[PDB]
Amino acid sequence: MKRTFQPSVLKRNRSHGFRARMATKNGRQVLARRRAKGRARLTVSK
Amino acid sequence: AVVKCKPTSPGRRHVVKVVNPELHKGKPFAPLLEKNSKSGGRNNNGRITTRHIGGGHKQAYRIVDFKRNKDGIPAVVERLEYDPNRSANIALVLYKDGERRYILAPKGLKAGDQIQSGVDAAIKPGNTLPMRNIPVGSTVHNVEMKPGKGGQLARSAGTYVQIVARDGAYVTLRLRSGEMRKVEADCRATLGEVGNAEHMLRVLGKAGAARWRGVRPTVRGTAMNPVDHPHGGGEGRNFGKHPVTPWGVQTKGKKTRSNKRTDKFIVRRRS
Amino acid sequence: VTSKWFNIDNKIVDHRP
RNA sequence: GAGGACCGAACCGACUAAUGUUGAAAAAUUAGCGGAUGACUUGUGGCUGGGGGUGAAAGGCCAAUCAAACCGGGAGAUAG
RNA sequence: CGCCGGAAGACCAAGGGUUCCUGUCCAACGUUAAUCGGGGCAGGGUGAGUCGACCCCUAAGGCGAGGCCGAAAGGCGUAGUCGAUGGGAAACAGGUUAAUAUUCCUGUACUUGGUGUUACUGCGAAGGGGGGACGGAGAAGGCUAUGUUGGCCGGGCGACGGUUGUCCCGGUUUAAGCGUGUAGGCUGGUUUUCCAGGCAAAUCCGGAAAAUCAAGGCUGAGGCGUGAUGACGAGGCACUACGGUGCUGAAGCAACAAAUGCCCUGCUUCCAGGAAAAGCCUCUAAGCAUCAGGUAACAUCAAAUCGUACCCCAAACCGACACAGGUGGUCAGGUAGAGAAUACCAAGGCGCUUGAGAGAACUCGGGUGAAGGAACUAGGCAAAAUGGUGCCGUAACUUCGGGAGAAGGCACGCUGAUAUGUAGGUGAGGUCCCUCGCGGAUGGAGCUGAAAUCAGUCGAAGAUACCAGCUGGCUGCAACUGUUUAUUAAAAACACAGCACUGUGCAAACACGAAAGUGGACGUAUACGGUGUGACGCCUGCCCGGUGCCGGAAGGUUAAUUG
RNA sequence: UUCCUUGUCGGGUAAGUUCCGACCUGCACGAAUGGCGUAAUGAUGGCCAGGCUGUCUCCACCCGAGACUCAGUGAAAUUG
RNA sequence: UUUAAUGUUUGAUGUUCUAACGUUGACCCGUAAUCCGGGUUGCGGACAGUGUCUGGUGGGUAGUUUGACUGGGGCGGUCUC
Ligand SMILES: N[C@@H](Cc1c[nH]c2ccccc12)C(=O)O
Ligand SMILES: [Mg+2]
Ligand SMILES: [Mg+2]
Ligand SMILES: [Mg+2]
Ligand SMILES: [Mg+2]
Ligand SMILES: [Mg+2]
Ligand SMILES: [Mg+2]
Ligand SMILES: [Mg+2]
Ligand SMILES: [Mg+2]
Ligand SMILES: [Mg+2]
Ligand SMILES: [Mg+2]
Ligand SMILES: [Mg+2]
Ligand SMILES: [Mg+2]
Ligand SMILES: [Mg+2]
Ligand SMILES: [Mg+2]
Ligand SMILES: [Mg+2]
Ligand SMILES: [Mg+2]
Ligand SMILES: [Mg+2]
Ligand SMILES: [Mg+2]
Ligand SMILES: [Mg+2]
Ligand SMILES: [Mg+2]
Ligand SMILES: [Mg+2]
Ligand SMILES: [Mg+2]
Ligand SMILES: [Mg+2]
Ligand SMILES: [Mg+2]
Ligand SMILES: [Mg+2]
Ligand SMILES: [Mg+2]
Ligand SMILES: [Mg+2]
Ligand SMILES: [Mg+2]
Ligand SMILES: [Mg+2]
Ligand SMILES: [Mg+2]
Ligand SMILES: [Mg+2]
Ligand SMILES: [Mg+2]
Ligand SMILES: [Mg+2]
Ligand SMILES: [Mg+2]
Ligand SMILES: [Mg+2]
Ligand SMILES: [Mg+2]
Ligand SMILES: [Mg+2]
Ligand SMILES: [Mg+2]
Ligand SMILES: [Mg+2]
Ligand SMILES: [Mg+2]
Ligand SMILES: [Mg+2]
Ligand SMILES: [Mg+2]
Ligand SMILES: [Mg+2]
Ligand SMILES: [Mg+2]
Ligand SMILES: [Mg+2]
């Protein structure tokens, strides 16, 4: 039937994109943690 | 004219509709319209703060003149119109200078009638005067409470206020609720009652007719679970408690007015 | 994965209450 | 030419039976079944956040999780 | 040979991202083999002033200089600035690659800017006005896409009786643009004077008065002319790597039927009363005044950047799979039919990536069944049966609408005549008239065409297949349409119109918020919140001791404070 | 809603713990946590009749897909 | 024991007032602005409102408790001398 993941790249970027993380203090702490861990991809971007 | 519909359908059996043949069949005056978007009862936090509000027909706001401060210039009633935002009808008036405005249509008003505002107007329905110039015992509507602020009392269909007494700087009014109130004698009021007094005789007839007005369904508290309402719970239909609101304050009797800065203006509460 | 459907069903499981 | 009107495909549902139950499928298939101009249905975008939301009210739904989501921490909780 | 054909065909948006095309390979992948592949390796392929994005403009909503508020982090919000799923300029037909095309080529167009020359001239906005600019249903009328038949052209004369004719097959296509202004729809027109309005001004918009003219204006599908002496074209001929390539080319008309598409954002009607802003048109203010600017003609230059392959009801997206699931929009042929249902077909695409045998029990999906006919069973579960159209006929009860398709019954094919094809629809030529045309009148050729009656006729059966109500009697509950436990419960439960009690006088009660603020509501007691009951009909009795709420204030008791 | 209880009487059946009508001895109905009616409606509960039938008496035969044999590929729960 | 007079306020109640305070009245300005601030004015006015302290109410919310023996548990009974 209809499943939970219904892709849309506009809603993907508006929700979890780089500029959405940078818009709040807690989003900038996520990016701080993912740099400290060494993640190759910080966010869901291009 | 209230007309009972014939029962060709079970949704039509109990419909009573009010038909006024004198309403304008056409579009409203476009310069005096505005956008008016619906809320859903939600505030700027995004939360439902009033229940049972939602959907309905799209509406446009008509800028109605509640102040009536174009003093001295006589105006003629052009037509009567439907207003979706209030229960009464609105009249389009044209001033002698060539300005058009909306007012609340009083009872007995027709297209072609002459209305005037200001202290020197005659005592005829539709005319606005400060209440120091209106004889005691007159029936008025669209009454101001602060001078220059616009009418705020007796604005729904069929309603009116009675000027009971005048004592120096205040007039005593009998409000439509039965309350006696004092307001300044310099506030304005319009002579006569608000038209469309047959509004209250209408019957909606079906559940979907109330959804067209933006009214969503009400769940009785006794039909919920205890986590939801103070009345929830039971095996079968059980109440055994004093009725209360969903937030635990007693309903059916407990008085909730607490305003000490306006107690001075209230001669007698409603009975 | 989840439990087998007969091990979740009350009718099959709850035979001796 | 009215109507939460009537019969009935698309469309939305899910009343009965049989199959399947290490399935074709972590809820379907076949044969019938209900509504079908409306309190209808759908695309796109938006808003409400966890003792909180939303609820035509079933303790239902809130990413196959719900009488209190998920992730990380207190944390090697405590366990006659 | 079989299957789909309102899809299992064609084109897209979203999503994916090289799966696209060519050569080459078969180790792994492909539920088997594989010389094949959406697999491996290598190479190639995506061409735009007009399509889409970007761009200008805004909705819901977001962020928010100052600001108000908050232990801090932060919350709200004004000016603003973003945000489409909506508004805003312009291109069509034909040809071509293995793979791209409204992008390349041929032919024919259009749009908006800048620069300069010439002619005339009041230009100017962050402001005023108009417009943009808007609902549901219904009813037709005028059309076209499209289809059928005839005419015309090219071919044919038949594997088995017949087939030179009232016979067979195939074709009969052409755009945007430009010119005209029609079926319709809306509206009285023109001039002058005056004015408490449109924040100021206005010659613009609104208002007032007089005069005069009976028409003017706006909008508008289609058709027609051109585009087009062109292109395309059944075929034919010449070659070929047998894939294709090259050359040549007939007819290209009329009648009828007809949309769910267009006129039509129209018209009629109802109540539930139906976006915003810019582009656009106009008026002026400050200002500039032989300037700048505006208008018109001509020349000239510019139109950048990004997407463009392929799949898209799917083996390429969401489901761990090459998974009987899910997925928004556009197109919409024939015969029967009311039809987008259903059966058979066209264009087109497929035969579902294990097969070969045999012909046991048993399981699954179906077909038929002697006599009986619910005796089965928890229970007619499941099956079987009914089933269309037209006409006749139809009870209790009723809120007078219903019940009602009650129940029940009759007719139904083909052929001929009425009538060499009727009633009806369309309507040429011709003649007449005038306004000389996209006109009116008359006229009836031609095309199309039910329904009926009579007579005959075949079969067991004429609604022949597919498709397509079982019906009646008594009673509980809930008035009714709806909603509900996604994934064992669809109900008598929830909702509901109606009823009643109750709070609320507006900075409302109430709710979300350490607060500011927001909703209620740009509402005002014929209103709003809460609670119970639940259409309608007849009704709703007694108890105020207990608990709760409302009112009272004498007296008793009673906090911080004082001392 | 009634335990005793399959109350008793009548109707329907050859035979009726269900159903319908009545009685009232209401364990333990009752008036907006509404009483009593009610036309129309319901994939709603119970009962009766007609038609129809493989539901049954009591099964028989036939058509397909598996099961069986052959070639290829090739699992699973479980297990001192 | 009971008074009355003068002077004095100690409170309390009422009546006026305006200058704190309020204004989700009007107008003007910042300003191209339904925020905010400033100014003029009207209306309320020492009331309302807010802080600290204090009595009442408070399943709206929170943390917890709700014994053992027992011919199974519960119900009953018992629990020390
Ligand atoms: N038995 C069914 C339905 C089912 C799914 N999950 C279940 C769990 C419990 C009981 C039944 C189910 C099945 O396996 O498909
Ligand atoms: Mg409500
Ligand atoms: Mg209600
Ligand atoms: Mg419940
Ligand atoms: Mg509670
Ligand atoms: Mg009970
Ligand atoms: Mg209907
Ligand atoms: Mg559902
Ligand atoms: Mg089905
Ligand atoms: Mg239907
Ligand atoms: Mg429960
Ligand atoms: Mg879930
Ligand atoms: Mg610890
Ligand atoms: Mg541990
Ligand atoms: Mg076929
Ligand atoms: Mg690849
Ligand atoms: Mg390929
Ligand atoms: Mg292989
Ligand atoms: Mg490949
Ligand atoms: Mg913008
Ligand atoms: Mg291609
Ligand atoms: Mg022969
Ligand atoms: Mg396959
Ligand atoms: Mg699939
Ligand atoms: Mg679909
Ligand atoms: Mg079909
Ligand atoms: Mg067999
Ligand atoms: Mg038989
Ligand atoms: Mg027989
Ligand atoms: Mg029996
Ligand atoms: Mg059945
Ligand atoms: Mg009963
Ligand atoms: Mg229903
Ligand atoms: Mg369920
Ligand atoms: Mg179900
Ligand atoms: Mg109820
Ligand atoms: Mg009291
Ligand atoms: Mg009985
Ligand atoms: Mg009761
Ligand atoms: Mg009771
Ligand atoms: Mg009572
Ligand atoms: Mg009661
Ligand atoms: Mg084998
Ligand atoms: Mg508790
Ligand atoms: Mg603890
Ligand atoms: Mg114990």
Q: How many CA atoms lie within 13 A of A29 on its CB side?
A: 3
Do B34 and B60 meet the contact criterion of CB atoms below 8 Å apart? yes
Reduced 3-state DSSP string for B191-228: ECCECCHHHHHCECCCHHHHHCCCECCCCCHHHCCCCC
- Cα separation, A38 vs B99, in Å, equals 71
Measured between alpha carbons, how far is A44 from A13 in angstroms, rounded to an integer?
7
Amino acid present at B94: L
**Ligand 1 touching residue C8 (CB < 6 A):** yes
Q: How many helices (H) and strands (E) does chain B have?
A: 1, 17
Domain end call among B65, B80, B113: B113
Whose tokens are 């008085």? That residue is: B255
For chain A, domains (ranges, CATH) are 1-46 (1.10.287.3980)
Resolution in Å, one decimal, please. 2.9
Protein-nucleic contacts, chain B 48-107 to strand D, CB < 7 Å:
48, 51, 54
Way the structure was solved: cryo-EM
Q: Return the partners of chain B (3 or more C-beta pairs < 8 Å).
A: none
Are B189 and B218 in a shared domain? no
Q: DSSP class of residue B258? A: -
Residues B188 and B211 reside in one and the same domain: no
CB B76 under 7 Å to nucleic chain E = no
Half-sphere exposure of B213 (CA within 13 A, CB side): 12
* CA atoms within a 13 Å half-sphere pointing along the CA-CB vector of B255: 5
Q: What is the residue range of B126's domain?
A: 117-194
**CA-to-CA separations, B165 to A38, B67, B144, in angstroms, rounded:** 83, 23, 16
Hey, what's the torsion of the CAs at A10, A14, A15, A20, to 10 degrees? Answer: 150
- Residue whose CA lies nearest to ligand 1 atom number 12: C5
CA of B87, C1' of E178: distance in angstroms: 58
Lookup result for tokens 């005319």: B127
Q: Which CATH number do you get for residue B59? A: 2.40.50.140
Q: For residue B65, which amino acid is it?
A: D
Rg (CA), chain A: 13
Q: Whose CA is nearest to atom 3 of ligand 1?
A: C5
Q: Is B48 left (phi over 0), alpha (psi -120 to 50) or beta?
A: beta
